[PDB]
Design an enzyme around this catalytic site. Structure first.
Site, short mmCIF file in Angstrom:
data_model
loop_
_atom_site.label_atom_id
_atom_site.label_comp_id
_atom_site.label_asym_id
_atom_site.label_seq_id
_atom_site.Cartn_x
_atom_site.Cartn_y
_atom_site.Cartn_z
N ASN A 124 -1.24 11.85 3.76
CA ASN A 124 -1.65 11.22 5.01
C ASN A 124 -3.15 11.28 5.25
O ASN A 124 -3.61 11.06 6.38
CB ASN A 124 -0.90 11.83 6.19
CG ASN A 124 0.52 11.37 6.24
OD1 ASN A 124 0.83 10.28 5.75
ND2 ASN A 124 1.42 12.18 6.79
N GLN A 174 10.92 6.02 3.73
CA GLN A 174 12.33 5.85 4.04
C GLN A 174 12.56 4.74 5.06
O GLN A 174 13.46 3.91 4.89
CB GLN A 174 12.92 7.18 4.53
CG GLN A 174 14.40 7.13 4.82
CD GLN A 174 15.01 8.51 4.87
OE1 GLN A 174 14.30 9.51 4.93
NE2 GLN A 174 16.34 8.57 4.83
N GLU A 178 -5.85 -0.32 10.97
CA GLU A 178 -7.08 -0.36 10.18
C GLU A 178 -6.76 -0.17 8.70
O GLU A 178 -5.93 0.67 8.33
CB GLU A 178 -7.99 0.78 10.65
CG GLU A 178 -9.25 0.94 9.85
CD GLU A 178 -10.15 1.98 10.46
OE1 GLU A 178 -9.65 2.76 11.31
OE2 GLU A 178 -11.33 2.01 10.10
N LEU A 179 -7.41 -0.98 7.85
CA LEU A 179 -7.19 -0.90 6.41
C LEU A 179 -8.05 0.21 5.82
O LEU A 179 -9.28 0.19 5.95
CB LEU A 179 -7.54 -2.22 5.75
CG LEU A 179 -7.37 -2.18 4.23
CD1 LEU A 179 -5.93 -1.84 3.86
CD2 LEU A 179 -7.80 -3.50 3.65
N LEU A 181 0.80 -1.22 0.00
CA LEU A 181 0.00 0.00 0.00
C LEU A 181 0.83 1.27 0.00
O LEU A 181 0.32 2.33 -0.36
CB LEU A 181 -0.96 0.01 1.20
CG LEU A 181 -1.87 -1.21 1.32
CD1 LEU A 181 -2.55 -1.25 2.69
CD2 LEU A 181 -2.90 -1.21 0.20
N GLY A 182 2.10 1.19 0.36
CA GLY A 182 2.91 2.40 0.45
C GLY A 182 4.27 2.12 1.04
O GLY A 182 4.48 1.10 1.70
N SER A 183 5.21 3.04 0.82
CA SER A 183 6.62 2.74 1.04
C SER A 183 7.34 4.05 1.34
O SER A 183 7.21 5.01 0.58
CB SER A 183 7.19 2.10 -0.23
OG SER A 183 8.57 1.83 -0.13
N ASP A 192 2.16 16.14 10.82
CA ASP A 192 2.47 15.66 9.47
C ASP A 192 1.23 15.64 8.59
O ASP A 192 1.08 14.74 7.76
CB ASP A 192 3.12 14.25 9.57
CG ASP A 192 3.94 13.87 8.33
OD1 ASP A 192 4.37 14.76 7.56
OD2 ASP A 192 4.16 12.65 8.13
N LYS A 225 -0.91 16.26 5.57
CA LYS A 225 -0.68 16.55 4.16
C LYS A 225 -1.51 15.56 3.36
O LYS A 225 -1.96 14.56 3.92
CB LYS A 225 0.82 16.42 3.82
CG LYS A 225 1.39 15.01 3.99
CD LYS A 225 2.88 15.06 4.09
CE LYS A 225 3.44 13.69 4.43
NZ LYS A 225 4.92 13.76 4.49
N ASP A 270 -0.89 7.81 9.54
CA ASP A 270 0.52 8.11 9.71
C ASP A 270 0.77 9.01 10.91
O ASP A 270 1.02 10.22 10.76
CB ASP A 270 1.15 8.67 8.45
CG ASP A 270 2.66 8.69 8.53
OD1 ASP A 270 3.20 8.56 9.65
OD2 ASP A 270 3.32 8.82 7.47
N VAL A 298 7.37 0.29 5.41
CA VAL A 298 6.58 -0.16 4.26
C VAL A 298 5.25 -0.67 4.79
O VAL A 298 5.19 -1.24 5.89
CB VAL A 298 7.34 -1.21 3.42
CG1 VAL A 298 7.74 -2.38 4.26
CG2 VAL A 298 6.50 -1.67 2.23
N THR A 302 7.30 17.58 5.67
CA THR A 302 7.44 17.89 4.25
C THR A 302 7.40 19.40 4.05
O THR A 302 6.41 20.04 4.46
CB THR A 302 6.31 17.24 3.47
OG1 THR A 302 6.46 15.81 3.55
CG2 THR A 302 6.32 17.66 2.01
O1 LIG Z 1 2.50 4.74 2.57
C1 LIG Z 1 2.34 5.04 3.71
C2 LIG Z 1 0.93 5.13 4.31
C3 LIG Z 1 0.12 4.09 4.10
C4 LIG Z 1 -1.24 3.40 4.38
C5 LIG Z 1 -2.17 2.94 3.45
C6 LIG Z 1 -3.35 2.34 3.91
C7 LIG Z 1 -3.56 2.22 5.28
O2 LIG Z 1 -4.69 1.63 5.86
C8 LIG Z 1 -2.63 2.69 6.17
BR1 LIG Z 1 -2.99 2.51 8.06
C9 LIG Z 1 -1.48 3.28 5.75
C10 LIG Z 1 3.51 5.36 4.68
C11 LIG Z 1 3.27 5.47 6.05
C12 LIG Z 1 4.32 5.76 6.92
C13 LIG Z 1 5.61 5.96 6.43
O3 LIG Z 1 6.66 6.26 7.32
C14 LIG Z 1 5.86 5.85 5.06
C15 LIG Z 1 4.81 5.55 4.19
O4 LIG Z 1 5.04 5.44 2.81
#
Ligand SMILES: O=C(/C=C/c1ccc(O)c(Br)c1)c1ccc(O)cc1O
Length: 275
Positions: free
Chosen positions: A142, A22, A93-94, A18-20, A137, A139, A159, A25, A178
């Protein structure tokens, strides 16, 4: 505080990423015992004291302790925490509808569409600030939607990696957020409180209405210099059919002195928002 040290893979199966970032993940996952679906955030631990890679245990525990306190429709809920030698794994939570950022790229929003999102953001921030939690944070990245295929999607703030409890009205720490969204006190390394989030909401609102970022420069230093000087304006090409009251709301948030900036309660009573 120690977390569950059984292998997460014995209790969950992971899927789509779902996301990535530094140091983290996030992967979609499914709990074996319930079939319920979650988002697993794998945070890389620091491997030595002095290292700069990974997240310090103090920072991880702070995020977990904040997540454990919160339960509100517009903020993510924490389900479980696991850990091993390499990672802390938050089972969260998704939220699968995608970013407000990416949904923005599909279309600028009308003021009604913007305020419908913004009101949910304000309600979530009102809950957090009521608990003296600064997010630090906020933005578009998030802010994610539960379902992006409805006329009025429901959003959740995700986040909490920079969030802090503000028990003395301010905290004196560096917040490497950011540049386009951080408040002047963050840029200037000043004491930080709930007011910094209200500046970020002002930036988010400007982007929601116009599709353009108010302080964005060609380099990060330019962006940070613009933020500190409050160097932004409403470009007629983008704002010519935006109401004066929407501009008034933004202008009362993008205020350098945190003491003169609208608070979360002010923002909910502002005539653009108040029903
Ligand atoms: O990609 C991110 C956020 C994703 C997400 C997607 C669907 C969800 O349900 C939830 Br919870 C979170 C992310 C978060 C923290 C970080 O330090 C770096 C990131 O890239």
């Amino acid at each position: 505080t120690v977390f569950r040290q059984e292998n997460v893979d014995d209790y969950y199966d992971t899927g789509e990423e779902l996301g990535s970032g530094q140091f983290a993940v996030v992967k979609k996952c499914r709990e074996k015992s319930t079939g319920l679906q979650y988002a697993a955030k794998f945070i890389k631990k620091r491997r030595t004291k002095s290292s700069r890679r990974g997240v310090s245990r103090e920072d991880i525990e702070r995020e977990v302790s904040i997540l454990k306190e919160i339960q509100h429709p517009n903020v993510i809920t924490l389900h479980e925490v696991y850990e091993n030698k390499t990672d802390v794994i938050l089972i969260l939570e998704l939220v699968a509808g995608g970013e407000l950022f990416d949904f923005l790229a599909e279309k600028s929003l009308t003021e009604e569409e913007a305020t419908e999102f913004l009101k949910q953001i304000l309600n979530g921030v009102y809950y957090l600030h009521s608990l003296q939690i600064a997010h630090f944070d906020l933005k578009p990245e998030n802010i994610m939607l539960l379902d992006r295929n409805v006329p009025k999607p429901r959003i959740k703030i995700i986040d909490f990696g920079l969030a802090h409890k503000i028990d003395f009205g301010n905290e004196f720490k560096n917040i490497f957020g950011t540049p386009e969204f951080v408040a002047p006190e963050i840029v200037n390394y000043e004491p930080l409180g709930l007011e910094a989030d209200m500046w970020s909401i002002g930036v988010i609102t400007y982007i929601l209405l116009s599709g353009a970022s108010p302080f964005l420069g060609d380099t990060k230093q330019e962006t940070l210099a613009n933020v500190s000087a409050v160097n932004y304006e409403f470009e007629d090409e983008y704002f010519s059919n935006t109401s004066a009251l929407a501009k008034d709301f933004i202008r009362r948030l993008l205020v350098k002195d945190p003491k003169k900036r609208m608070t979360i309660q002010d923002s909910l009573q502002h005539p653009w928002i108040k029903p």
